[PDB]
């Protein structure tokens, strides 16, 4: 059984979004499909089910009048459309197939198979690549250095160090959402102080939603340089 969802979405308040869930490996019409969402760092929230045989649906009261679930049996695909979007709708949306065949007329709320999730970001902000600032080495013991990846939208970004060659001691933090509506994150690495004179450090930043890629050299401050 595989459930494969459509890609990430970005929407303005008041707009609508429609997420797809393509099923394979079983008889699509034979099982309820549910949708469940999860806001970043929050719990699971059930949204509704569809019976793909009949097209009948049932929605959580929270979304009644605002969510529509449909399917195309011809291509074994289920859809969830959420309208009048608000920033609070920013979340990962999942489809999940019930465990039992509808024909069993039994408990249809065991979520046995899940799609990979679809991130939907809702904001008045517009797509924007990050500024990447160095966080200069903290000593001329152990030193810390990093990159500040500031003012981008939407999530996500990826960071590596030295093209993936440097992994020990790296922490790329969860982004915070600034009052401005843009995200910011730091990626740091701890290293021996003695290596600052000789070892090059570059953070590799990739923000696919803006097709932005930046490799930033992080060097000791001029007052800390010896050559």
């Amino acid at each position: 059984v595989q459930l494969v969802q459509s890609g990430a979405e970005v929407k303005k308040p008041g707009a609508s979004v429609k997420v797809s869930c393509k099923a394979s490996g079983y008889t699509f019409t034979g099982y309820y499909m549910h949708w469940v969402r999860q806001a970043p760092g929050q719990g699971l929230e059930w949204m509704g089910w569809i019976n793909p045989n009949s097209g009948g649906t049932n929605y959580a009261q929270k979304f009644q009048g605002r969510v529509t679930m449909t399917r195309d049996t011809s291509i074994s695909t289920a859809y969830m459309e959420l309208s009048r979007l608000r920033s609070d709708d920013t979340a990962v949306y999942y489809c999940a197939r019930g465990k039992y065949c509808t024909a069993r007329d039994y408990y249809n709320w065991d979520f046995q198979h899940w799609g990979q999730g679809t991130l939907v970001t809702v904001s008045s902000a517009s797509t924007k690549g990050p500024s990447v600032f160095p966080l200069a080495p903290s000593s001329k013991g152990t030193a810390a250095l990093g990159c500040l990846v500031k003012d981008y939208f939407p999530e996500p970004v990826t960071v590596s160090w030295n093209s993936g060659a440097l992994t020990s001691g790296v922490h790329t933090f969860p982004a915070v959402l600034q009052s401005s509506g843009l995200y910011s994150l730091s990626s740091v690495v701890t290293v021996p102080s003695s290596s600052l004179g000789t070892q090059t450090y570059i953070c590799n930043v990739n923000h696919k939603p803006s097709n932005t890629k930046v490799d930033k050299r992080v060097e000791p401050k001029s007052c800390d340089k010896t050559h």
């Binding site: 600032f133 933090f173 915070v176 600034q178």
Partner: protein
């Protein structure tokens, strides 16, 4: 109806027995499922219809209970079992229990970073404080600017517990206007944590 899980966080060492509770605020059904979720992954069905193990789920997992009181028991924890666990029945999900690894207390290593010259060129200054590789998760950061305690002008985030060393790390960013940054001299972050016998302060002087 609400499903209430306890505890919110369960901290145990590998090899120990874990017991997680899920209580319904009113009788809804004796059907209850448990799910496991790891960071950046979809939930996984562990136990269905109260007491049955899902396919591919190891025997150390068992579920029990009926009415409004249910339990998930893991006989002896394995490293891969540390995750968030949710119970669910019909439309209702519990709020989750985070099952985290208990390890020896580790004080954070603390580092402070000034705004970069690059950033300053643009009107904003971000000062960053790093608390590296500590345990347990609870920690307090206080910013000071020329010995004045700051409030209302910082944000922080904390990593997921590290899968290899079981520590947490924390990053705090103080946001100031460039004028305010150039106006003041001593920047400090003061860190309180169980692993420190007294607060540690990392600082720098702007321009020096």
């Amino acid at each position: 109806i609400v499903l209430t899980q306890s505890p919110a966080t369960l901290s145990l060492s590998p090899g120990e027995r874990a017991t997680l509770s899920c209580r319904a605020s009113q009788s809804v059904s004796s059907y209850l499922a448990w799910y496991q979720q790891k960071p950046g992954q979809a939930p996984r069905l562990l136990i269905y219809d109260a007491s049955n193990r899902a396919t591919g789920i190891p025997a150390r997992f068992s579920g029990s209970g009926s009415g409004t009181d249910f339990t998930l028991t893991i006989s002896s924890l394995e490293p891969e079992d540390f995750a968030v666990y949710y119970c669910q029945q019909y439309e209702f999900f519990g709020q989750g229990t985070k099952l985290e690894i208990k390890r020896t207390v580790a004080a954070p290593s603390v580092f402070i970073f000034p705004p970069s010259d690059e950033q300053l060129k643009s009107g904003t200054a971000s000062v960053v404080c790093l608390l590296n590789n500590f345990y347990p998760r609870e920690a307090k950061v206080q910013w000071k600017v020329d010995n004045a305690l700051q409030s209302g002008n910082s944000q922080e985030s904390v990593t997921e517990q590290d899968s290899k060393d079981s520590t947490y790390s924390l990053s705090s960013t103080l946001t100031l206007s460039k004028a305010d940054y150039e106006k003041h001299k001593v920047y400090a972050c003061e860190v309180t944590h169980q692993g420190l016998s007294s607060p540690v302060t990392k600082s720098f002087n702007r321009g020096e």
